[PDB]
Amino acid sequence: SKMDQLRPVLGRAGVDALWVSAPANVRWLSGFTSAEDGKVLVSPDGATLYTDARYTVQAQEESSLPQYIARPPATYEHAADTVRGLRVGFEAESLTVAELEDLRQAWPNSTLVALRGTLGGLRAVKTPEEIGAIRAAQDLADRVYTEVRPMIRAGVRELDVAVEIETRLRRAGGESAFELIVASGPNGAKPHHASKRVIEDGDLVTIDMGARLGGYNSDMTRTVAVGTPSAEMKRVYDAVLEAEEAAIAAIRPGVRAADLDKLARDLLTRHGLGEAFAHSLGHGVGLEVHEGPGLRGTSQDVLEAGMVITIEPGAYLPGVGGVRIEDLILVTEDGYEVLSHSAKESV
Amino acid sequence: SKMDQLRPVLGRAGVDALWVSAPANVRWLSGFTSAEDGKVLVSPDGATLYTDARYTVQAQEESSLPQYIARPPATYEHAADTVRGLRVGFEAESLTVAELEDLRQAWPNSTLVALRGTLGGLRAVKTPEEIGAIRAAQDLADRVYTEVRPMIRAGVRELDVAVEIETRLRRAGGESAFELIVASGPNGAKPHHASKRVIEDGDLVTIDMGARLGGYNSDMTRTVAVGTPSAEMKRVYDAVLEAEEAAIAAIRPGVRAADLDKLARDLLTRHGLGEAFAHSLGHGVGLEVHEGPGLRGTSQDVLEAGMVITIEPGAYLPGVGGVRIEDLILVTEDGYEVLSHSAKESV
Numbered sequence: 001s002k003m004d005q006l007r008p009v010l011g012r013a014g015v016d017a018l019w020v021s022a023p024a025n026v027r028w029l030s031g032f033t034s035a036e037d038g039k040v041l042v043s044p045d046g047a048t049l050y051t052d053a054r055y056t057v058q059a060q061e062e063s064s065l066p067q068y069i070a071r072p073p074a075t076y077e078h079a080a081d082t083v084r085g086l087r088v089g090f091e092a093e094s095l096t097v098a099e100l101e102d103l104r105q106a107w108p109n110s111t112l113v114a115l116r117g118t119l120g121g122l123r124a125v126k127t128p129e130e131i132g133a134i135r136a137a138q139d140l141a142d143r144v145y146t147e148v149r150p151m152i153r154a155g156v157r158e159l160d161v162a163v164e165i166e167t168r169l170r171r172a173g174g175e176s177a178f179e180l181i182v183a184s185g186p187n188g189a190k191p192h193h194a195s196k197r198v199i200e201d202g203d204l205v206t207i208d209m210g211a212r213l214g215g216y217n218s219d220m221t222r223t224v225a226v227g228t229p230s231a232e233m234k235r236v237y238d239a240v241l242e243a244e245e246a247a248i249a250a251i252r253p254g255v256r257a258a259d260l261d262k263l264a265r266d267l268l269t270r271h272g273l274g275e276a277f278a279h280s281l282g283h284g285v286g287l288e289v290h291e292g293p294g295l296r297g298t299s300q301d302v303l304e305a306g307m308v309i310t311i312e313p314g315a316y317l318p319g320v321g322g323v324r325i326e327d328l329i330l331v332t333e334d335g336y337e338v339l340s341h342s343a344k345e346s347v
Numbered sequence: 348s349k350m351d352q353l354r355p356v357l358g359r360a361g362v363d364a365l366w367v368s369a370p371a372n373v374r375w376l377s378g379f380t381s382a383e384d385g386k387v388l389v390s391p392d393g394a395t396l397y398t399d400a401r402y403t404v405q406a407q408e409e410s411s412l413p414q415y416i417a418r419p420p421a422t423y424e425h426a427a428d429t430v431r432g433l434r435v436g437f438e439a440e441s442l443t444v445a446e447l448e449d450l451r452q453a454w455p456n457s458t459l460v461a462l463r464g465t466l467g468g469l470r471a472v473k474t475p476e477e478i479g480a481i482r483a484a485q486d487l488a489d490r491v492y493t494e495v496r497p498m499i500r501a502g503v504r505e506l507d508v509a510v511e512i513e514t515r516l517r518r519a520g521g522e523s524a525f526e527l528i529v530a531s532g533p534n535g536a537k538p539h540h541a542s543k544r545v546i547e548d549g550d551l552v553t554i555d556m557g558a559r560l561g562g563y564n565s566d567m568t569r570t571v572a573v574g575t576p577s578a579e580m581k582r583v584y585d586a587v588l589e590a591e592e593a594a595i596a597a598i599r600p601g602v603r604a605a606d607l608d609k610l611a612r613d614l615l616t617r618h619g620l621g622e623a624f625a626h627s628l629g630h631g632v633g634l635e636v637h638e639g640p641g642l643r644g645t646s647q648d649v650l651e652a653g654m655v656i657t658i659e660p661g662a663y664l665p666g667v668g669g670v671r672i673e674d675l676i677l678v679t680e681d682g683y684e685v686l687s688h689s690a691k692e693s694v
């Protein structure tokens with residue numbers, strides 16, 4: 001029914017067909033797992049996966065769409081017959097200008113229509129299979145975080161904590177989902193990863209990590225104390241945890257993403273941290289680490305059952321320290337389920 | 348003098364200015380190391396790095412170009428005054444259609460000109476500083492390969508060899524430059540990394556790896572025997588090594604890239620492997636793992652001193668095994684220098 005829903009979405013967008021080039025959307029539509037080397041045409045006649053003959057067996061095993069096996073430009077030249085006379089959308093935030101020129105030459109009797117975000121709303125609600133995959137990725141992340149966290153102590157390099165997490169994710173058959181952040185002391189205030197800095201007694205340490213497993217992602221963030229933090233950084237931590245648990249507890253179908261953001265910013269302001277926080281509270285997670293919906297104050301997104309999102313308030317005191325705490329949340333029919341189960345400690 | 352050369356290149360391309368969006372070319376032009384978050388305008392008035400105020404200090408420390416500090420769209424709106432009346436090239440293989448539309452709106456009195464490969468020839472010849480950086484990356488790769496290679500023996504998973512290489516690269520302050528290949532037995536024939544397969548007595552094992560360090564890349568490939576290979580796979584290995592050393596020995600300023608490719612394909616044919624080899628012999632390496640020049644049979648590239656390229660014949664017997672051997676080569680004023688120093692073994 002994802003494909004059942006897409007052609008009406010295309011009609012609402014004013015097009016008859018869609019050339020799908022973003023790798024995550026090629027994979028979402030077809031099941032093909034080397035999607036950088038595939039493209040999909042959705043048309044009034046059906047939907048076809050285009051990929052080359054190095055992928056013949058893989059694509060036959062994986063793809064829920066019929067395959068046309070060729071290299072570019074034979075793929076979209078062959079497609080040209082299907083799109084004669086039509087308005088063909090393409091993904092303007094993905095397709096390069098050179099690729100557009102190539103399609104324009106191949107499809108002289110079509111009108112190419114630049115579209116933005118066309119599949120983003122459909123990707124936001126996950127199927128049961130996708131939720132299972134995300135649970136497995138987050139379970140791997142929780143296992144490795146829980147195994148590694150005891151190593152976080154005075155004298156350890158940030159980089160070495162990241163290396164240990166990455167090693168265990170990869171040995172398990174997954175991978176770190178994005179560049180791992182291990183930020184101690186004043187590095188916890190910085191907007192921009194894991195440096196060679198040695199963790200010091202008294203520091204908070206923020207660990208931002210996720211696993212990619214089976215093409216699906218997870219995402220959590222934890223902050224922990226090494227020794228006894230300053231009273232100030234303890235207040236920051238406790239406020240950020242307060243904000244995170246309050247925003248999570250408001251998740252339900254129909255809540256506006258922007259109203260979740262407002263709840264967290266109001267709480268941080270009340271706790272004297274109202275100019276210290278980041279400007280988005282969270283994002284969807286799935287085939288990409290960052291995807292829809294978006295939880296900014298300007299968001300028009302409305303949560304519904306089946307979405308998977310992060311909730312991540314933070315507060316940063318430049319030159320001093322900072323705290324982020326984040327969980328991965330499934331929206332359910334009548335509330336939420338927290339998927340990230342690693343401990344959240346006191347400090 | 349790289350910038351001294353670029354404006355004449357633009358003139359030959361028929362444009363007055365260039366909007367540089369590809370991260371490697373932003374970094375190449377400016378020195379800025381978070382180049383996904385910078386853009387460069389080259390214009391008749393000069394060259395400017397555009398980035399946001401989170402990078403103020405970093406960009407002042409790193410950039411050889413003056414900085415205009417803003418977020419998009421203020422960056423290219425501010426630039427609009429500079430490009431009034433001009434033909435402005437952009438990088439058509441990098442810029443998305445949405446980004447082009449954004450520039451078209453901002454620059455209504457300019458003509459936007461789609462260009463391909465504009466900076467690729469200038470990037471191909473490295474400066475002394477860049478050669479130093481590439482040597483350091485390849486030296487790190489050689490150290491880690493040499494440390495890890497003794498672990499390659501019967502009973503070991505391919506994945507575990509890759510994990511060990513990645514762990515050591517990261518702990519040293521670098522990173523694996525691309526998805527590491529450790530391909531044993533019949534996996535050595537496959538076109539498409541490091542699986543959970545257990546290496547078997549009698550297998551050849553192909554290790555394709557590089558380090559990224561300081562923004563510069565390296566690249567080598569080795570094949571080694573575990574135990575005694577079949578006579579057949581020994582013939583394949585010896586032929587591929589013969590081809591690699593012969594092609595390397597023909598490198599000098601003025602040699603045509605396509606003629607190096609022909610030398611290797613003719614040698615593999617003579618050794619009964621003339622339908623088993625890949626269709627490019629090698630590529631440049633620098634800020635990206637794969638960059639110009641290109642060593643295909645159709646290449647028009649001519650090597651010159653200062654280029655850094657791979658030479659990588661291979662031969663694959665599907666269902667059976669395969670061999671690739673690759674070194675990283677600096678073209679010198681009167682020959683070549685092999686930068687990758689790890690042992691090449693007999694089998």
Ligand code: NA
Pocket residue numbers: 208209219220221326
């Ligand atoms: Na996170």
Ligand code: NA
Pocket residue numbers: 555556566567568673
């Ligand atoms: Na290689």
